């Protein structure tokens with residue numbers, strides 16, 4: 001019922017909504033898991049094919065219908081309202097597992113206040129006799145003679161035991177960790193208190209909050225590019241291997257990284273664009289913001305892969321045999337980088353503060369989008385007041401209780417299963433394909449273009465029309481069929497095999513989001 005007070009608020013909110021952990025943490029290890037470069041080819045293809053057109057489509061639908069995640073599809077096609085519900089389920093699961101990264105970040109922040117960084121060396125109560133210094137790991141006298149593969153690094157050991165304490169498998173949950181639960185509770189309390197008061201933006205602090213992360217990223221890039229072995233990392237990151245293009249995995253994990261980074265199919269963008277003025281030019285902004293996001297991801301990829309190549313040269317092993325083919329890549333690369341900056345504790349605190357800022361503002365945007373998408377369903381009941389406040393309290397408490405399962409001794413396997421099935425992969429393809437299909441073949445590209453021209457002042461080019469019509473559905477169907485034809489089970493890191501019931505649980509997680517689309521159709525057609 002309210003609009004933006006000024007047009008800078010919309011730009012700042014959208015800039016803080018889709019820039020964060022998906023550009024600095026998830027993109028690097030997805031690039032690292034595959035060859036690199038062979039991941040970039042489908043990335044840019046998917047970018048210019050679907051990433052920008054669907055984002056602009058969501059913004060235009062929000063601006064043209066003046067509604068949220070679910071109700072927007074009611075003014076387009078009532079039969080396909082299940083896309084909103086699927087988006088809400090996806091964003092709920094994402095909210096559940098996405099704050100554990102912030103919990104690890106605040107655990108590192110609290111551990112950073114010591115005079116000496118704990119992960120710099122290994123002289124501790126949780127170190128194997130196999131540990132050796134990263135500087136001393138590559139030595140022709142003591143390491144290359146024997147036990148080359150048995151050795152491990154202090155950073156990896158810290159991440160595996162002190163923070164994670166890995167159990168032998170998912171079948172052995174172990175005991176609960178109380179400090180991580182406390183950190184999770186603290187982050188959830190901060191998130192709840194920032195919505196109690198409805199604090200949004202500032203007067204003379206936004207130009208600090210939105211510019212400090214970029215300055216920190218610039219310092220990180222300058223540090224990384226000046227380290228030995230950065231050229232090998234850049235070559236690994238850029239030059240593609242044509243053989244890997246025949247594996248469905250790279251094609252399916254390159255087209256979903258973009259859908260994750262641009263916050264597509266979550267219901268957040270169709271609500272962010274709702275408060276805009278009717279006669280406002282959003283094309284230029286959608287283009288500039290997409291350019292900013294993709295450039296940030298590409299530059300951060302340079303920054304992380306430089307130090308990755310440096311570490312691989314330092315340990316004297318293969319590029320693919322360092323760090324982790326999983327969610328722990330950032331928490332191994334970045335701390336190793338800040339270990340060598342002057343005054344390491346200060347830069348460590350600054351880096352974890354900016355990481356928390358990037359994660360939190362996104363968390364705020366996604367929680368706000370979920371709450372809006374919910375309250376447009378029931379305005380009278382979820383009227384502003386105490387009811388809406390206890391609603392947020394209940395949602396936060398339930399999400400904390402569910403996320404407790406990832407802080408046990410076997411929570412890492414649950415976390416990897418969630419990352420791979422919950423709010424990524426095939427469900428994103430499902431919802432994106434249905435969105436593009438319903439908007440291009442049921443509603444009409446020309447019919448939309450008339451609305452844009454009425455709202456923007458001129459007729460746009462036919463690029464997005466032909467994108468929505470053919471380019472995105474073809475890719476979405478091809479990737480899905482190609483993955484089904486050649487099936488490969490998920491493996492955590494590289495040497496681990498999941499039990500069959502765990503894979504069944506993951507497929508149930510994905511199908512919980514998928515089946516919203518056909519069940520709503522059969523329910524509506526029943527009566």
Ligand SMILES: CC(C)CCC[C@@H](C)[C@H]1CC[C@H]2[C@@H]3CC=C4C[C@@H](OC(=O)CCC(=O)O)CC[C@]4(C)[C@H]3CC[C@]12C
Nearest residue numbers: 084085086087088089090091092093374377378512513
């Ligand atoms: C799957 C979980 C872990 C995450 C997502 C939960 C919510 C997005 C879902 C769960 C149950 C759903 C509710 C199940 C039943 C109904 C009744 C339904 O009412 C009717 O069928 C009557 C007509 C109408 O009220 O529109 C309205 C939607 C609603 C509130 C649903 C709204 C969306 C809810 C809360």
Ligand SMILES: CC(C)CCC[C@@H](C)[C@H]1CC[C@H]2[C@@H]3CC=C4C[C@@H](OC(=O)CCC(=O)O)CC[C@]4(C)[C@H]3CC[C@]12C
Nearest residue numbers: 092093096370374378381391394395398399400402403
């Ligand atoms: C992924 C899970 C573990 C965390 C997030 C779950 C929530 C997004 C879901 C779980 C159950 C849902 C609730 C289930 C039932 C209802 C009743 C219904 O509200 C009413 O219509 C109230 C009765 C009326 O006055 O009509 C729809 C909203 C609500 C509160 C739902 C809101 C969304 C909730 C809290």
Ligand SMILES: CC(C)CCC[C@@H](C)[C@H]1CC[C@H]2[C@@H]3CC=C4C[C@@H](OC(=O)CCC(=O)O)CC[C@]4(C)[C@H]3CC[C@]12C
Nearest residue numbers: 085089508509511512513515516519520523524525527
């Ligand atoms: C871990 C998983 C397997 C738990 C179970 C998940 C499903 C059983 C839930 C999750 C979301 C639910 C859906 C959320 C929203 C709706 C819309 C609701 O339709 C309406 O509110 C309007 C219908 C009409 O107006 O005709 C019908 C129930 C349905 C499909 C729900 C059916 C049950 C679903 C698929």
Ligand SMILES: *[C@@H]1O[C@H](CO)[C@@H](O)[C@H](O)[C@H]1NC(C)=O
Nearest residue numbers: 121122123124125126127128
């Ligand atoms: C660190 O290593 C020394 C050996 O020089 C050992 O005596 C000491 O107990 C270690 N510190 C621990 C295990 O906390």
Ligand SMILES: *[C@@H]1O[C@H](CO)[C@@H](O)[C@H](O)[C@H]1NC(C)=O
Nearest residue numbers: 135136138139140141142143
């Ligand atoms: C390699 O090991 C030998 C003996 O253990 C030691 O003298 C030498 O200093 C080590 N190399 C480096 C670079 O420290």
Ligand SMILES: *[C@@H]1O[C@H](CO)[C@@H](O)[C@H](O)[C@H]1NC(C)=O
Nearest residue numbers: 130145146147148149150151
């Ligand atoms: C080291 O790893 C190898 C296999 O990679 C294993 O056979 C061996 O037992 C391990 N330990 C030692 C001391 O070699």
Ligand SMILES: N=C(N)NCCS(=O)(=O)O
Nearest residue numbers: 018019020021022023263
């Ligand atoms: N939208 C999702 N799924 N995650 C946030 C995107 S980012 O801010 O981490 O780039």
Ligand SMILES: [Cl-]
Nearest residue numbers: 023027261297
């Ligand atoms: Cl990205």
Ligand code: NA
Nearest residue numbers: 016019020362
């Ligand atoms: Na952000």
Ligand code: NA
Nearest residue numbers: 018022023261
């Ligand atoms: Na992003």
